[PDB]
Scaffold this active site. Structure first.
Site, PDB file in Angstrom:
ATOM      1  N   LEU A   1     -19.208 -21.808  19.666  1.00  0.00           N
ATOM      2  CA  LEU A   1     -17.931 -21.433  18.983  1.00  0.00           C
ATOM      3  C   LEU A   1     -18.035 -19.578  19.423  1.00  0.00           C
ATOM      4  CD1 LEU A   1     -16.688 -20.052  16.348  1.00  0.00           C
ATOM      5  CD2 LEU A   1     -18.972 -19.856  15.546  1.00  0.00           C
TER       6      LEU A   1
ATOM      7  N   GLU B   1     -24.314 -24.561  23.489  1.00  0.00           N
ATOM      8  CA  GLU B   1     -25.079 -23.232  22.951  1.00  0.00           C
ATOM      9  C   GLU B   1     -25.638 -23.510  21.464  1.00  0.00           C
ATOM     10  OE1 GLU B   1     -21.497 -22.483  20.075  1.00  0.00           O
ATOM     11  OE2 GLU B   1     -21.189 -24.161  19.692  1.00  0.00           O
TER      12      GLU B   1
HETATM   13  C1  LIG Z   1     -22.534 -22.966  16.243  1.00  0.00           C
HETATM   14  C2  LIG Z   1     -22.376 -21.284  16.631  1.00  0.00           C
HETATM   15  N1  LIG Z   1     -22.580 -20.912  17.889  1.00  0.00           N
HETATM   16  C3  LIG Z   1     -22.062 -19.661  17.416  1.00  0.00           C
HETATM   17  C4  LIG Z   1     -23.109 -19.085  16.106  1.00  0.00           C
HETATM   18  C5  LIG Z   1     -22.533 -17.440  16.299  1.00  0.00           C
HETATM   19  O1  LIG Z   1     -21.432 -16.606  16.250  1.00  0.00           O
HETATM   20  P1  LIG Z   1     -21.671 -15.376  16.059  1.00  0.00           P
HETATM   21  O2  LIG Z   1     -22.168 -14.075  16.944  1.00  0.00           O
HETATM   22  O3  LIG Z   1     -19.755 -14.763  15.416  1.00  0.00           O
HETATM   23  O4  LIG Z   1     -22.599 -14.593  14.466  1.00  0.00           O
HETATM   24  C6  LIG Z   1     -23.133 -19.950  14.910  1.00  0.00           C
HETATM   25  C7  LIG Z   1     -23.806 -18.332  13.782  1.00  0.00           C
HETATM   26  N2  LIG Z   1     -22.706 -18.545  12.625  1.00  0.00           N
HETATM   27  C8  LIG Z   1     -23.545 -17.938  12.091  1.00  0.00           C
HETATM   28  C9  LIG Z   1     -24.802 -17.369  11.705  1.00  0.00           C
HETATM   29  C10 LIG Z   1     -24.206 -18.835  10.771  1.00  0.00           C
HETATM   30  O5  LIG Z   1     -23.356 -20.612  10.979  1.00  0.00           O
HETATM   31  O6  LIG Z   1     -25.269 -18.971  10.050  1.00  0.00           O
HETATM   32  C11 LIG Z   1     -22.754 -20.885  14.970  1.00  0.00           C
HETATM   33  O7  LIG Z   1     -23.110 -21.698  13.758  1.00  0.00           O
END
Ligand SMILES: Cc1ncc(COP(=O)(O)O)c(CN[C@H](C)C(=O)O)c1O
Ligand SMILES: Cc1ncc(COP(=O)(O)O)c(CN[C@H](C)C(=O)O)c1O
Lengths: 277, 277
Positions: free
Chosen positions: B201, B177
């Site tokens: 995640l 990712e």
């Molecule tokens: C490592 C990682 N993978 C995947 C995602 C995407 O998950 P989602 O679509 O539910 O936001 C995120 C972003 N999270 C948030 C935005 C952050 O740390 O800002 C992440 O930190």
């Protein structure tokens, strides 16, 4: 008591952390623990050097120089009238609007340092302790003493739930280090321990123990051993600033040899005692 | 403005975070980010569900019902008069004298939440962005949205220094990712993305996009791809609560097809728009 906040010595009740401190949102910071013996800081030079080294490794520029850091640590102990226990100190990248990358404009790193009265683990040093094997699921930069300690938290908790003093971590059966210590094995008068690469923290106590072995002329081989080999070692022990040389006499119900503290572990402890302030 | 502190919406300056709050010393906590469009929260219940799941995975039990949490986030958005931006919220194990293992007597978890006005990334959504491959050195529980984010900090920083919007992580040459997003690839009209295991995640945007593919009759394969395979894809894009569907047109100077946004990405962007508040 008194806490070191940045470059100031303030009353405990005055200290508050910002919700946007990168150490609170990313664990973006490094730390140290220094043992104090009768008002004397043990190997403080090595611990301060490592704090700055860990910092440099994640490109954090500590706002003041080493000389100033030692001076602040020296007055912190005197101000708290610390006799025997330890000093905990950390530095984060600082406070700024949340974003993964480094703050565009260099912000000031946050520093926290405090003390705690805590005697030496005499009963453990004399009697030895029980340990348990736990899969090492941490990141690949264990050489940096960072605030990202969630893996070690879960591991320590598992060990305590089993009545064990420490969790001995392993990557696919290969012993690395403990949740908050380094692991040593002894077989036929030879001292074995995992090499100091990205897989383990190069402990200060680990280095002092290896220095002790060289002084008493005990063969030292910095090569890794498996969980199965560890079980068939003549002697076994763990090292840390707070645990010193703590003998491990049992792992998951299985006795290390006869379940008694070994001869070389004793010789090593004896030599380590000559270093104590 | 106003900050969510446990279950009260107070002023930013009235919040007191302790130096021994476990989220500060061990990154012992979890978090979420929710996008707000014109004062309306997007997929809030899905994010709240994940917060609780993340928390329980590390044995933290949030005191309030999920509906009470939803009501708290709603009040926060109104008190701050947030139009388009996002809400950031987290929960740590709480404040207790420093020790790796869980607090003997359960202390109260600490909840913190706040807002930030931030527009939709219009330019990136239409033009696409540049990315860079970076080795994934993070821990093995990436399925938990924890505060242990030092790996992602270093990865994002490396991307920015190279003039890239995102770092596409890879373990064993296999794309996992992004430093703060999920990665998707398209080839021959098929949509590919790494399966939701401990290596990534399970993003909320990721799930919505997979649901969008189903709705537009596009085949989905949750199988992992290598960096070599990523460079050979017909189309490529990253997803996150803040990035929505941002196309990637170039990786390390190597164009993806012709360096322009593909048709299937466009179809997905169009279906995704129907879900927005
Ligand atoms: C490592 C990682 N993978 C995947 C995602 C995407 O998950 P989602 O679509 O539910 O936001 C995120 C972003 N999270 C948030 C935005 C952050 O740390 O800002 C992440 O930190
Ligand atoms: C993973 C790990 N390995 C090894 C050590 C020992 O290093 P040293 O000998 O320099 O203390 C520790 C414990 N450090 C401190 C004591 C802690 O976290 O409390 C540690 O966290």
């Amino acid at each position: 008591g008194y806490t070191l906040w940045n470059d100031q010595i303030v009353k405990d009740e005055e200290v508050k952390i910002d919700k946007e401190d990168r150490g609170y949102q990313f664990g973006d910071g490094v730390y140290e623990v220094v043992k104090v013996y009768n008002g004397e800081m043990f190997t403080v030079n090595e611990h301060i050097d490592r704090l700055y080294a860990s910092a440099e490794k994640i490109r954090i520029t500590i706002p003041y120089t080493k000389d100033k850091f030692h001076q602040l640590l020296h007055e912190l102990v005197e101000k708290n009238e610390l006799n025997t226990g330890h000093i905990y100190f950390q530095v984060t990248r600082g406070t700024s609007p949340r974003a993964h990358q480094f703050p565009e404009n260099t912000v000031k790193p946050v520093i926290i340092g405090y003390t705690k009265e805590n005697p030496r683990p005499l009963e453990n040093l004399e009697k030895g302790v029980k340990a348990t094997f736990v899969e090492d699921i941490r990141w690949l930069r264990c050489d940096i003493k960072s605030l990202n300690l969630l893996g070690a938290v879960l591991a320590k908790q598992e060990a305590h739930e089993k009545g064990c003093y420490e969790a001995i971590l392993h990557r696919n059966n290969t012993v690395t280090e403990g949740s908050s210590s380094n692991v040593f094995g002894i077989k036929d008068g030879i001292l074995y321990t995992h090499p100091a690469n990205n897989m383990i923290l190069k402990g200060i106590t680990r280095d002092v123990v290896i220095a002790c072995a060289n002084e008493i002329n005990m063969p030292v081989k910095e090569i890794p051993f498996t969980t199965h080999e560890a079980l068939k070692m003549d002697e076994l022990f763990v090292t840390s600033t707070t645990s010193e040389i703590t003998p491990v006499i049992e792992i998951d119900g299985k006795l290390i040899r006869d379940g008694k503290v070994g001869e070389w572990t004793r010789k090593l402890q004896k030599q380590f005692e000559t270093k104590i302030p």
